[PDB]
Structure formats: structure tokens, C-alpha cells
Amino acid sequence: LYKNHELLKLERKKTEAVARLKSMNKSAINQYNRRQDKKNKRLKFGHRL
Amino acid sequence: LQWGKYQTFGVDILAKLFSLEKPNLNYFKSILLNNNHKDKKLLR
């Protein structure tokens, strides 16, 4: 019981580190796609004028 | 030893209840170191 609780708690710490690492990647990927979008909508407005 | 064996059950209860560093461990820590209003008054 003591070993599993320690191991399970350690795994929960691992999930927090993992979700956090993953969350920051998701935010990062979304931001990059937003930069490309703005750049495109801009170039598109220019090319229409 | 021959007087009784009911003490071993208490030892076993404590060893297993302490295993849960959640509600049980927090409660025992608070009690050993030191409607919810009624519970606080009754505890004091």
C-alpha cells in the first residue's frame, strides 16, 4: 500500500509535468498558426487592393 | 502475550489507516499535533 501510494503520487507528479509540457506545446502550436494566419490575411488584403 | 491478542488488531488498524496521505493522514496530523462549527467546538 505504501509503495503504490508513493508510486501513484510520483506518477501524478509525472502527469502534471507532462500535461504542463504538453499544454505549453499546444499553446505554442496555436500561436504559431495564428502568426501565419495574420500574415496571410494581411498579404491577401494587400493583393486585393 | 498470553494476557490478550486484541492489541495486535489496533496496531494493524493504525498501520493501514496511516497509508492514505489524503483525508486520513491530514486528520491524524491535525489531531496529534494540536455543522462544521459544531465539529470544531466538539473537537476542542
Experimental determination approach used: cryo-EM
Helices (H), B1-44: 7-17, 23-33, 36-43
The dihedral built from the CA positions of residue A5, A8, A10 and A12, taken in this order, carries a sign that is: negative
Residues A1, B16: C-beta atoms closer than 8 Å? yes
CA gyration radius, chain B? 15
Gaps in chain A following residue numbers (C to N > 2.5 A): none
How many angstroms separate the Cα of A46 from the Cα of each of A32, A33, A39, B39? 22, 20, 11, 71
Whether residue B18 contacts residue B25, with contact meaning beta carbons closer than 8 Å, is answered with yes
Contact B19, A4 (CB under 8 A): no
B25 contacts A13 by C-beta, under 8 angstroms: no
Measured in angstroms, the resolution is 2.9
Find, in chain B, the residue whose alpha carbon is nearest to that of A9. Answer: B21
